[PDB]
Amino acid sequence: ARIAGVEIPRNKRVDVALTYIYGIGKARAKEALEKTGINPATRVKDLTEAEVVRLREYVENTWKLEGELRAEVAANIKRLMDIGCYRGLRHRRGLPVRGQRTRTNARTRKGPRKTVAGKKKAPRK
Amino acid sequence: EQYYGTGRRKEAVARVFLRPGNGKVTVNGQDFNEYFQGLVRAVAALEPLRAVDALGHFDAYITVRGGGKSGQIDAIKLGIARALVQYNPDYRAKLKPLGFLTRDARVVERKKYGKHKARRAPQYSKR
Amino acid sequence: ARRRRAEVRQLQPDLVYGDVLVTAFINKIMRDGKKNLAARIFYDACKIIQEKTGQEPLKVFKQAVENVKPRMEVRSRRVGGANYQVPMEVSPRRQQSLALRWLVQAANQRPERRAAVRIAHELMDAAEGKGGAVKKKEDVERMAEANRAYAHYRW
Amino acid sequence: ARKALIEKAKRTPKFKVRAYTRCVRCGRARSVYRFFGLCRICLRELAHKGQLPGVRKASW
Amino acid sequence: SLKKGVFVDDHLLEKVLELNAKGEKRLIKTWSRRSTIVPEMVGHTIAVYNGKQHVPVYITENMVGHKLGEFAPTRTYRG
Amino acid sequence: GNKIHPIGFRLGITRDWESRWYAGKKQYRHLLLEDQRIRGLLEKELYSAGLARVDIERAADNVAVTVHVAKPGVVIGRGGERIRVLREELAKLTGKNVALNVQEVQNPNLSAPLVAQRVAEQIERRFAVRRAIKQAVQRVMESGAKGAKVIVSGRIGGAEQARTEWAAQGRVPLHTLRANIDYGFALARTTYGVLGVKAYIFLGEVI
Amino acid sequence: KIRIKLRGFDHKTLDASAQKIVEAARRSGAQVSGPIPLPTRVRRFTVIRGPFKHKDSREHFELRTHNRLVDIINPNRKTIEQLMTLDLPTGVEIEIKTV
RNA sequence: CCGCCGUUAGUUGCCAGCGGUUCGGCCGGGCACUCUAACGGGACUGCCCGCGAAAGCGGGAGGAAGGAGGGGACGACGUCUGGUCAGCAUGGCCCUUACGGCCUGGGCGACACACGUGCUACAAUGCCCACUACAAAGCGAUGCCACCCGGCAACGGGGAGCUAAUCGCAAAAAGGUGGGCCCAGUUCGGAUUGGGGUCUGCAACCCGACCCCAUGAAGCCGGAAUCGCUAGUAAUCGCGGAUCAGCCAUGC
RNA sequence: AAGGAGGUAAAAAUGGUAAAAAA
């Protein structure tokens, strides 16, 4: 069922199938499920290929997916390195783009953690 | 003519009216079997009328509000129990050894300041 | 507590059949504050038992009770710079407590389809004797036997 | 400071969002119950002296 | 941020219309790093005020609808 | 050591506010303000003869300039001229309506605040604390109560180590409610700092 | 048809109002709606111990306004006359509304 | 303060009694019943059975209520040369066209770790969608906003009532009735991020929040050791408030 | 099993920290 970028979901609700695709959250799933026709509840495996092909026609036409999407974001990332806008400044650093915290919490937009030696403290007893 | 039960538990007023009949029992408008569907403790509150087998011969008008559904159920326990302990005080002396006289004491205590859920103390460090 | 001898306190005179142990087991089935659907689930299981077999639900229940009885459970003795790991004749209250709870978690331990299903199928094999809580029963019996040296080291 | 603080609040500058409470009988901007115009301890002291009306040593 | 409209210093626009009126010497030096780099600033040297010095930044276009001082790090040492 | 305000402990039925009027949610705060500034300006420029109750009755612009003092005659004026100016300073700084009150209670050693005030007066002018203060407690009990406890914190005679003295006589049940314990705290202040003069006075039960 | 709402601070004179009031209205007139108690209005304030950084360990304090109600049926001269002026709420005020 | 009962009381309530009902306690009226809030009554080992030299002890009874009935505010004499003059006072000390005031912005939100304490998760008692009912409390007049409409939404236009037990926040959620998912990093989990709006406010980059689409990481229940809790308590689930334009509130 | 007494066995991983002084 390689509709999208080598995307084959197989036997399940057509909506979950669609959901498994980049560029397609459940919203876009039911969106194509009201625009192309095809019934959500009915299983994607037992489909009929006419409705299928017109479906894949509506899908990639009106909107696009992973190939451009992420890459495009990496071009707006080229811009995030254009001068080093603080967004892309921090993106270059390897840290979150929001000016949130970085004292303690940073386990996603950075790696896990990379140990030092504590450097100890000031009297606490 | 009427058999009134003043019913209450954990703040939930079961205003109980009784007349004789068969099984027409309306809990605040709606039939019993919808106003408390799913709860197993529903039929449990049907213990007082069932402990005297005069369960049937009653057409009750039961206005029940406030508090909580299950608490409503227990409230109707106290209500039923109060309505019949009235109009034939024989059942009174024999129903106390079943407890169907005591109202309640199990009430959600004030959430205490300092601690979380009225008693749940906040975690301890020291180290 | 040190001043008292506490209490067990009578539980709930089973909301249906008419016996404490039923709503006791349901009590330990319960999802912390959600007795409702736990009791439900349990009775789904029970009626399914009654649609699978021809033996009474309360009967097979008592058979679970008996099939997992820790006649002698293992605790520990008093001796300062050590602890003698020592078994002892249990109280039927504690026996039953431990027991029914073990049945609970033996049902829980089965990676099955549904709650009522787990509880049910467990109750089947466990009342039979080919079960987890049963195995741990006979096992703790082995502990009280392999420690029959600690038969007069019981506190 | 502190002195020219009460001024800033007593004088009320330009835009709406530069304002901040003030314990007029103690002198603080934060945690001031804007019903008494009092901080927590200003409120407490007047409450205890027997100098706060309507109110009471709550004990529910 | 701004929803219907957009933020930028008015002294800015008014100064845009002068520096454009001649196309004069460089150096726009805002003591205000807030103000958005709104479309009509072309691509001139921006000596925005830090809190320290006047951080100068050659604006292009990949930044237009997004604040001026948004481009100075100010906070020194990183990771 | 604490001791939650026996005064604010008596709030129930053993003490009514030093201010009894109606206050609406809106104009409430402002009433508290106006009144507080009033009270305060009384306190100092109407210190003179020592007073306890600073009561106020109000409603719609009516103001009960109400005070319980230890002396009236030398705070009313040599010709009723002290009432004049003061009452009018009020009506000036409170452009509304004023009506004085110099209610006097015949006993000084009775009622704590002003005995605390006089005790603090003694040491403010450098007297020996422990002696004069203990015998002051004994003045209060010369009047006849069931308890009087005048503790005094702060720098005694200097010497840095500012402790607290222990002076008391008679039973003192401030755990009890129906007991009516008058309590007064006088602010002692030496050239070498600040001292605290607390005075407890026990009335009795069934009141 | 006369709706007099009581806004007081202390239930003492507030109910002491209520009583004498309803008398002298039954006096100079006729039927008086007995003093009906609106739920006493309370405000909540939850302060702490000391000025020093303590968060926990606290004391809470409550504002206690009281609200009541008195009505009658007839606007006789004498009723109005007496009960319009002969007041003494040194710490209570009310609201006259009609229906 | 909270459970039983009592007297008064009536725009919340009520047909409990009858009348009518655009069949709404809406239209008459009552106060018993819900209730709201002041003055009470009620429980003392007071009684019955047994024991203990007594205290006290077991059992049982009338009871809404048993032997301290559930919670609060109450916290001594006093220890700690504990803390806070950055709430406040107050001794001393220093500065004094500056270690003082205003303004602007930057900052206290930083990032190589460590730790406290929390939240939501890792799931089939579960997660999604639809449907029908019960909260106590506090809050609310340039506030509360019902309501119709605009927009996928945020939120906005027009526009009722209310200084309120009378109008509104308000949508409780757990429940339960009906279908999906079918042991997969899964329709689990929302972290990261980009793409757009709105609202706040002079103004939101560092630095707000809300909303729409997409990316959907880590995370498959956590060793050394350690928290809390004896009964409407544990857990679970929801809600109001204070400070607030807004809000970093998973805080209290 | 009361006390008190008379002889036999028990029981501390480790601890440095001062000082004119205040009444």
PDB file of all heavy atoms in Angstrom, chain H residues 50-60:
ATOM      1  P     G H  50     -24.475 -10.542  88.130  1.00  0.00           P
ATOM      2  OP1   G H  50     -24.880 -11.413  89.260  1.00  0.00           O
ATOM      3  OP2   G H  50     -24.482  -9.064  88.292  1.00  0.00           O
ATOM      4  O5'   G H  50     -23.005 -10.973  87.703  1.00  0.00           O
ATOM      5  C5'   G H  50     -22.680 -12.337  87.499  1.00  0.00           C
ATOM      6  C4'   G H  50     -21.364 -12.468  86.784  1.00  0.00           C
ATOM      7  O4'   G H  50     -21.398 -11.657  85.577  1.00  0.00           O
ATOM      8  C3'   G H  50     -20.151 -11.945  87.536  1.00  0.00           C
ATOM      9  O3'   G H  50     -19.642 -12.843  88.508  1.00  0.00           O
ATOM     10  C2'   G H  50     -19.182 -11.634  86.409  1.00  0.00           C
ATOM     11  O2'   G H  50     -18.620 -12.829  85.890  1.00  0.00           O
ATOM     12  C1'   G H  50     -20.138 -11.059  85.367  1.00  0.00           C
ATOM     13  N9    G H  50     -20.273  -9.599  85.529  1.00  0.00           N
ATOM     14  C8    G H  50     -21.304  -8.837  86.028  1.00  0.00           C
ATOM     15  N7    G H  50     -21.030  -7.553  86.022  1.00  0.00           N
ATOM     16  C5    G H  50     -19.743  -7.469  85.497  1.00  0.00           C
ATOM     17  C6    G H  50     -18.882  -6.364  85.239  1.00  0.00           C
ATOM     18  O6    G H  50     -19.076  -5.153  85.419  1.00  0.00           O
ATOM     19  N1    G H  50     -17.665  -6.790  84.704  1.00  0.00           N
ATOM     20  C2    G H  50     -17.321  -8.099  84.450  1.00  0.00           C
ATOM     21  N2    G H  50     -16.120  -8.361  83.927  1.00  0.00           N
ATOM     22  N3    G H  50     -18.106  -9.118  84.684  1.00  0.00           N
ATOM     23  C4    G H  50     -19.280  -8.728  85.199  1.00  0.00           C
ATOM     24  P     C H  51     -18.929 -12.265  89.829  1.00  0.00           P
ATOM     25  OP1   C H  51     -18.683 -13.386  90.774  1.00  0.00           O
ATOM     26  OP2   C H  51     -19.707 -11.081  90.276  1.00  0.00           O
ATOM     27  O5'   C H  51     -17.513 -11.752  89.314  1.00  0.00           O
ATOM     28  C5'   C H  51     -16.564 -12.661  88.779  1.00  0.00           C
ATOM     29  C4'   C H  51     -15.426 -11.945  88.096  1.00  0.00           C
ATOM     30  O4'   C H  51     -15.949 -10.930  87.198  1.00  0.00           O
ATOM     31  C3'   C H  51     -14.475 -11.167  88.995  1.00  0.00           C
ATOM     32  O3'   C H  51     -13.519 -11.980  89.647  1.00  0.00           O
ATOM     33  C2'   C H  51     -13.857 -10.170  88.030  1.00  0.00           C
ATOM     34  O2'   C H  51     -12.868 -10.797  87.226  1.00  0.00           O
ATOM     35  C1'   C H  51     -15.056  -9.834  87.142  1.00  0.00           C
ATOM     36  N1    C H  51     -15.757  -8.607  87.592  1.00  0.00           N
ATOM     37  C2    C H  51     -15.110  -7.396  87.352  1.00  0.00           C
ATOM     38  O2    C H  51     -14.012  -7.426  86.783  1.00  0.00           O
ATOM     39  N3    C H  51     -15.684  -6.232  87.732  1.00  0.00           N
ATOM     40  C4    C H  51     -16.871  -6.242  88.332  1.00  0.00           C
ATOM     41  N4    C H  51     -17.387  -5.059  88.681  1.00  0.00           N
ATOM     42  C5    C H  51     -17.562  -7.465  88.590  1.00  0.00           C
ATOM     43  C6    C H  51     -16.978  -8.612  88.208  1.00  0.00           C
ATOM     44  P     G H  52     -13.016 -11.591  91.122  1.00  0.00           P
ATOM     45  OP1   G H  52     -12.001 -12.595  91.528  1.00  0.00           O
ATOM     46  OP2   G H  52     -14.228 -11.379  91.953  1.00  0.00           O
ATOM     47  O5'   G H  52     -12.250 -10.204  90.936  1.00  0.00           O
ATOM     48  C5'   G H  52     -10.835 -10.178  90.796  1.00  0.00           C
ATOM     49  C4'   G H  52     -10.298  -8.782  90.574  1.00  0.00           C
ATOM     50  O4'   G H  52     -10.969  -8.159  89.437  1.00  0.00           O
ATOM     51  C3'   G H  52     -10.513  -7.775  91.695  1.00  0.00           C
ATOM     52  O3'   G H  52      -9.678  -7.937  92.828  1.00  0.00           O
ATOM     53  C2'   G H  52     -10.355  -6.460  90.955  1.00  0.00           C
ATOM     54  O2'   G H  52      -9.000  -6.246  90.582  1.00  0.00           O
ATOM     55  C1'   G H  52     -11.162  -6.780  89.701  1.00  0.00           C
ATOM     56  N9    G H  52     -12.583  -6.586  90.024  1.00  0.00           N
ATOM     57  C8    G H  52     -13.552  -7.537  90.246  1.00  0.00           C
ATOM     58  N7    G H  52     -14.705  -7.030  90.579  1.00  0.00           N
ATOM     59  C5    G H  52     -14.470  -5.661  90.605  1.00  0.00           C
ATOM     60  C6    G H  52     -15.345  -4.587  90.905  1.00  0.00           C
ATOM     61  O6    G H  52     -16.543  -4.614  91.210  1.00  0.00           O
ATOM     62  N1    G H  52     -14.695  -3.366  90.806  1.00  0.00           N
ATOM     63  C2    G H  52     -13.377  -3.197  90.469  1.00  0.00           C
ATOM     64  N2    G H  52     -12.981  -1.921  90.445  1.00  0.00           N
ATOM     65  N3    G H  52     -12.530  -4.176  90.178  1.00  0.00           N
ATOM     66  C4    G H  52     -13.160  -5.372  90.274  1.00  0.00           C
ATOM     67  P     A H  53     -10.360  -8.244  94.254  1.00  0.00           P
ATOM     68  OP1   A H  53      -9.351  -8.851  95.157  1.00  0.00           O
ATOM     69  OP2   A H  53     -11.623  -8.977  93.994  1.00  0.00           O
ATOM     70  O5'   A H  53     -10.766  -6.811  94.820  1.00  0.00           O
ATOM     71  C5'   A H  53     -11.470  -6.673  96.049  1.00  0.00           C
ATOM     72  C4'   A H  53     -11.058  -5.409  96.756  1.00  0.00           C
ATOM     73  O4'   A H  53      -9.772  -5.626  97.398  1.00  0.00           O
ATOM     74  C3'   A H  53     -10.841  -4.214  95.833  1.00  0.00           C
ATOM     75  O3'   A H  53     -12.023  -3.455  95.625  1.00  0.00           O
ATOM     76  C2'   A H  53      -9.728  -3.434  96.517  1.00  0.00           C
ATOM     77  O2'   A H  53     -10.252  -2.640  97.573  1.00  0.00           O
ATOM     78  C1'   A H  53      -8.897  -4.561  97.120  1.00  0.00           C
ATOM     79  N9    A H  53      -7.891  -5.080  96.174  1.00  0.00           N
ATOM     80  C8    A H  53      -7.885  -6.358  95.673  1.00  0.00           C
ATOM     81  N7    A H  53      -6.905  -6.617  94.851  1.00  0.00           N
ATOM     82  C5    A H  53      -6.205  -5.423  94.807  1.00  0.00           C
ATOM     83  C6    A H  53      -5.048  -5.056  94.104  1.00  0.00           C
ATOM     84  N6    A H  53      -4.387  -5.885  93.291  1.00  0.00           N
ATOM     85  N1    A H  53      -4.594  -3.793  94.266  1.00  0.00           N
ATOM     86  C2    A H  53      -5.268  -2.972  95.085  1.00  0.00           C
ATOM     87  N3    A H  53      -6.368  -3.203  95.800  1.00  0.00           N
ATOM     88  C4    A H  53      -6.792  -4.464  95.618  1.00  0.00           C
ATOM     89  P     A H  54     -13.016  -3.802  94.409  1.00  0.00           P
ATOM     90  OP1   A H  54     -14.331  -4.171  94.991  1.00  0.00           O
ATOM     91  OP2   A H  54     -12.309  -4.741  93.503  1.00  0.00           O
ATOM     92  O5'   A H  54     -13.181  -2.424  93.626  1.00  0.00           O
ATOM     93  C5'   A H  54     -13.610  -1.245  94.294  1.00  0.00           C
ATOM     94  C4'   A H  54     -12.580  -0.148  94.185  1.00  0.00           C
ATOM     95  O4'   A H  54     -11.276  -0.682  94.526  1.00  0.00           O
ATOM     96  C3'   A H  54     -12.381   0.467  92.804  1.00  0.00           C
ATOM     97  O3'   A H  54     -13.346   1.466  92.504  1.00  0.00           O
ATOM     98  C2'   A H  54     -10.960   1.015  92.884  1.00  0.00           C
ATOM     99  O2'   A H  54     -10.948   2.271  93.547  1.00  0.00           O
ATOM    100  C1'   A H  54     -10.275  -0.018  93.787  1.00  0.00           C
ATOM    101  N9    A H  54      -9.489  -1.018  93.031  1.00  0.00           N
ATOM    102  C8    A H  54      -9.927  -2.152  92.392  1.00  0.00           C
ATOM    103  N7    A H  54      -8.970  -2.839  91.811  1.00  0.00           N
ATOM    104  C5    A H  54      -7.823  -2.111  92.083  1.00  0.00           C
ATOM    105  C6    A H  54      -6.473  -2.310  91.745  1.00  0.00           C
ATOM    106  N6    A H  54      -6.027  -3.345  91.027  1.00  0.00           N
ATOM    107  N1    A H  54      -5.580  -1.392  92.177  1.00  0.00           N
ATOM    108  C2    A H  54      -6.024  -0.353  92.896  1.00  0.00           C
ATOM    109  N3    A H  54      -7.263  -0.058  93.277  1.00  0.00           N
ATOM    110  C4    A H  54      -8.129  -0.987  92.832  1.00  0.00           C
ATOM    111  P     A H  55     -13.884   1.684  91.001  1.00  0.00           P
ATOM    112  OP1   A H  55     -14.865   2.797  91.041  1.00  0.00           O
ATOM    113  OP2   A H  55     -14.292   0.367  90.447  1.00  0.00           O
ATOM    114  O5'   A H  55     -12.607   2.175  90.180  1.00  0.00           O
ATOM    115  C5'   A H  55     -12.261   3.551  90.081  1.00  0.00           C
ATOM    116  C4'   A H  55     -10.879   3.726  89.492  1.00  0.00           C
ATOM    117  O4'   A H  55      -9.980   2.769  90.107  1.00  0.00           O
ATOM    118  C3'   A H  55     -10.749   3.478  87.992  1.00  0.00           C
ATOM    119  O3'   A H  55     -11.000   4.653  87.235  1.00  0.00           O
ATOM    120  C2'   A H  55      -9.315   2.975  87.839  1.00  0.00           C
ATOM    121  O2'   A H  55      -8.402   4.063  87.800  1.00  0.00           O
ATOM    122  C1'   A H  55      -9.103   2.223  89.149  1.00  0.00           C
ATOM    123  N9    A H  55      -9.393   0.780  89.076  1.00  0.00           N
ATOM    124  C8    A H  55     -10.588   0.234  89.446  1.00  0.00           C
ATOM    125  N7    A H  55     -10.643  -1.059  89.350  1.00  0.00           N
ATOM    126  C5    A H  55      -9.387  -1.405  88.912  1.00  0.00           C
ATOM    127  C6    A H  55      -8.866  -2.669  88.630  1.00  0.00           C
ATOM    128  N6    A H  55      -9.607  -3.781  88.776  1.00  0.00           N
ATOM    129  N1    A H  55      -7.583  -2.711  88.203  1.00  0.00           N
ATOM    130  C2    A H  55      -6.914  -1.551  88.080  1.00  0.00           C
ATOM    131  N3    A H  55      -7.310  -0.297  88.317  1.00  0.00           N
ATOM    132  C4    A H  55      -8.586  -0.287  88.740  1.00  0.00           C
ATOM    133  P     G H  56     -11.866   4.622  85.881  1.00  0.00           P
ATOM    134  OP1   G H  56     -11.234   5.581  84.941  1.00  0.00           O
ATOM    135  OP2   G H  56     -13.299   4.752  86.241  1.00  0.00           O
ATOM    136  O5'   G H  56     -11.665   3.159  85.291  1.00  0.00           O
ATOM    137  C5'   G H  56     -10.535   2.838  84.499  1.00  0.00           C
ATOM    138  C4'   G H  56     -10.202   1.375  84.612  1.00  0.00           C
ATOM    139  O4'   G H  56     -10.425   0.925  85.976  1.00  0.00           O
ATOM    140  C3'   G H  56     -11.057   0.434  83.784  1.00  0.00           C
ATOM    141  O3'   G H  56     -10.687   0.396  82.416  1.00  0.00           O
ATOM    142  C2'   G H  56     -10.888  -0.887  84.522  1.00  0.00           C
ATOM    143  O2'   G H  56      -9.627  -1.475  84.234  1.00  0.00           O
ATOM    144  C1'   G H  56     -10.874  -0.412  85.975  1.00  0.00           C
ATOM    145  N9    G H  56     -12.220  -0.483  86.580  1.00  0.00           N
ATOM    146  C8    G H  56     -13.099   0.511  86.955  1.00  0.00           C
ATOM    147  N7    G H  56     -14.219   0.037  87.452  1.00  0.00           N
ATOM    148  C5    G H  56     -14.072  -1.345  87.407  1.00  0.00           C
ATOM    149  C6    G H  56     -14.941  -2.408  87.793  1.00  0.00           C
ATOM    150  O6    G H  56     -16.075  -2.363  88.293  1.00  0.00           O
ATOM    151  N1    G H  56     -14.358  -3.650  87.546  1.00  0.00           N
ATOM    152  C2    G H  56     -13.112  -3.851  87.000  1.00  0.00           C
ATOM    153  N2    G H  56     -12.694  -5.112  86.836  1.00  0.00           N
ATOM    154  N3    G H  56     -12.306  -2.875  86.641  1.00  0.00           N
ATOM    155  C4    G H  56     -12.845  -1.665  86.869  1.00  0.00           C
ATOM    156  P     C H  57     -11.797   0.116  81.285  1.00  0.00           P
ATOM    157  OP1   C H  57     -11.204   0.425  79.961  1.00  0.00           O
ATOM    158  OP2   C H  57     -13.090   0.728  81.692  1.00  0.00           O
ATOM    159  O5'   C H  57     -11.979  -1.457  81.339  1.00  0.00           O
ATOM    160  C5'   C H  57     -10.843  -2.300  81.318  1.00  0.00           C
ATOM    161  C4'   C H  57     -11.223  -3.720  81.622  1.00  0.00           C
ATOM    162  O4'   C H  57     -11.503  -3.877  83.042  1.00  0.00           O
ATOM    163  C3'   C H  57     -12.498  -4.215  80.968  1.00  0.00           C
ATOM    164  O3'   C H  57     -12.390  -4.490  79.586  1.00  0.00           O
ATOM    165  C2'   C H  57     -12.842  -5.408  81.831  1.00  0.00           C
ATOM    166  O2'   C H  57     -11.961  -6.493  81.580  1.00  0.00           O
ATOM    167  C1'   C H  57     -12.528  -4.838  83.215  1.00  0.00           C
ATOM    168  N1    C H  57     -13.729  -4.172  83.770  1.00  0.00           N
ATOM    169  C2    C H  57     -14.765  -5.025  84.141  1.00  0.00           C
ATOM    170  O2    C H  57     -14.598  -6.243  84.029  1.00  0.00           O
ATOM    171  N3    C H  57     -15.911  -4.518  84.635  1.00  0.00           N
ATOM    172  C4    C H  57     -16.063  -3.203  84.760  1.00  0.00           C
ATOM    173  N4    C H  57     -17.229  -2.781  85.262  1.00  0.00           N
ATOM    174  C5    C H  57     -15.029  -2.291  84.378  1.00  0.00           C
ATOM    175  C6    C H  57     -13.890  -2.812  83.886  1.00  0.00           C
ATOM    176  P     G H  58     -13.377  -3.730  78.570  1.00  0.00           P
ATOM    177  OP1   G H  58     -12.534  -2.958  77.623  1.00  0.00           O
ATOM    178  OP2   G H  58     -14.414  -3.031  79.377  1.00  0.00           O
ATOM    179  O5'   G H  58     -14.101  -4.908  77.784  1.00  0.00           O
ATOM    180  C5'   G H  58     -13.360  -6.030  77.336  1.00  0.00           C
ATOM    181  C4'   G H  58     -14.048  -7.325  77.685  1.00  0.00           C
ATOM    182  O4'   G H  58     -14.140  -7.479  79.127  1.00  0.00           O
ATOM    183  C3'   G H  58     -15.486  -7.464  77.223  1.00  0.00           C
ATOM    184  O3'   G H  58     -15.608  -7.759  75.846  1.00  0.00           O
ATOM    185  C2'   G H  58     -16.007  -8.554  78.145  1.00  0.00           C
ATOM    186  O2'   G H  58     -15.484  -9.817  77.762  1.00  0.00           O
ATOM    187  C1'   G H  58     -15.346  -8.144  79.458  1.00  0.00           C
ATOM    188  N9    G H  58     -16.202  -7.204  80.203  1.00  0.00           N
ATOM    189  C8    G H  58     -15.916  -5.897  80.515  1.00  0.00           C
ATOM    190  N7    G H  58     -16.875  -5.305  81.170  1.00  0.00           N
ATOM    191  C5    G H  58     -17.860  -6.275  81.293  1.00  0.00           C
ATOM    192  C6    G H  58     -19.136  -6.210  81.910  1.00  0.00           C
ATOM    193  O6    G H  58     -19.659  -5.251  82.490  1.00  0.00           O
ATOM    194  N1    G H  58     -19.822  -7.419  81.807  1.00  0.00           N
ATOM    195  C2    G H  58     -19.335  -8.545  81.188  1.00  0.00           C
ATOM    196  N2    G H  58     -20.137  -9.619  81.186  1.00  0.00           N
ATOM    197  N3    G H  58     -18.146  -8.617  80.610  1.00  0.00           N
ATOM    198  C4    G H  58     -17.463  -7.455  80.699  1.00  0.00           C
ATOM    199  P     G H  59     -16.616  -6.908  74.929  1.00  0.00           P
ATOM    200  OP1   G H  59     -16.181  -7.083  73.521  1.00  0.00           O
ATOM    201  OP2   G H  59     -16.763  -5.545  75.508  1.00  0.00           O
ATOM    202  O5'   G H  59     -18.013  -7.649  75.108  1.00  0.00           O
ATOM    203  C5'   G H  59     -18.086  -9.066  75.123  1.00  0.00           C
ATOM    204  C4'   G H  59     -19.316  -9.543  75.850  1.00  0.00           C
ATOM    205  O4'   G H  59     -19.235  -9.166  77.247  1.00  0.00           O
ATOM    206  C3'   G H  59     -20.631  -8.942  75.382  1.00  0.00           C
ATOM    207  O3'   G H  59     -21.147  -9.592  74.237  1.00  0.00           O
ATOM    208  C2'   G H  59     -21.526  -9.070  76.607  1.00  0.00           C
ATOM    209  O2'   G H  59     -22.058 -10.383  76.706  1.00  0.00           O
ATOM    210  C1'   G H  59     -20.522  -8.874  77.744  1.00  0.00           C
ATOM    211  N9    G H  59     -20.528  -7.505  78.302  1.00  0.00           N
ATOM    212  C8    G H  59     -19.497  -6.593  78.325  1.00  0.00           C
ATOM    213  N7    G H  59     -19.817  -5.473  78.920  1.00  0.00           N
ATOM    214  C5    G H  59     -21.131  -5.654  79.324  1.00  0.00           C
ATOM    215  C6    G H  59     -22.014  -4.790  80.029  1.00  0.00           C
ATOM    216  O6    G H  59     -21.820  -3.638  80.443  1.00  0.00           O
ATOM    217  N1    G H  59     -23.253  -5.391  80.225  1.00  0.00           N
ATOM    218  C2    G H  59     -23.599  -6.650  79.806  1.00  0.00           C
ATOM    219  N2    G H  59     -24.838  -7.063  80.086  1.00  0.00           N
ATOM    220  N3    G H  59     -22.788  -7.458  79.157  1.00  0.00           N
ATOM    221  C4    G H  59     -21.579  -6.903  78.951  1.00  0.00           C
ATOM    222  P     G H  60     -21.807  -8.724  73.062  1.00  0.00           P
ATOM    223  OP1   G H  60     -22.261  -9.656  71.998  1.00  0.00           O
ATOM    224  OP2   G H  60     -20.844  -7.648  72.717  1.00  0.00           O
ATOM    225  O5'   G H  60     -23.103  -8.086  73.739  1.00  0.00           O
ATOM    226  C5'   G H  60     -24.203  -8.911  74.090  1.00  0.00           C
ATOM    227  C4'   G H  60     -25.162  -8.230  75.036  1.00  0.00           C
ATOM    228  O4'   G H  60     -24.457  -7.631  76.148  1.00  0.00           O
ATOM    229  C3'   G H  60     -25.983  -7.080  74.483  1.00  0.00           C
ATOM    230  O3'   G H  60     -27.059  -7.520  73.673  1.00  0.00           O
ATOM    231  C2'   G H  60     -26.440  -6.368  75.754  1.00  0.00           C
ATOM    232  O2'   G H  60     -27.562  -7.032  76.311  1.00  0.00           O
ATOM    233  C1'   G H  60     -25.250  -6.596  76.691  1.00  0.00           C
ATOM    234  N9    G H  60     -24.448  -5.383  76.948  1.00  0.00           N
ATOM    235  C8    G H  60     -23.172  -5.073  76.545  1.00  0.00           C
ATOM    236  N7    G H  60     -22.769  -3.910  76.995  1.00  0.00           N
ATOM    237  C5    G H  60     -23.836  -3.428  77.746  1.00  0.00           C
ATOM    238  C6    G H  60     -23.994  -2.224  78.489  1.00  0.00           C
ATOM    239  O6    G H  60     -23.193  -1.290  78.624  1.00  0.00           O
ATOM    240  N1    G H  60     -25.240  -2.151  79.107  1.00  0.00           N
ATOM    241  C2    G H  60     -26.211  -3.115  79.019  1.00  0.00           C
ATOM    242  N2    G H  60     -27.353  -2.872  79.674  1.00  0.00           N
ATOM    243  N3    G H  60     -26.076  -4.235  78.333  1.00  0.00           N
ATOM    244  C4    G H  60     -24.875  -4.329  77.726  1.00  0.00           C
TER     245        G H  60
END
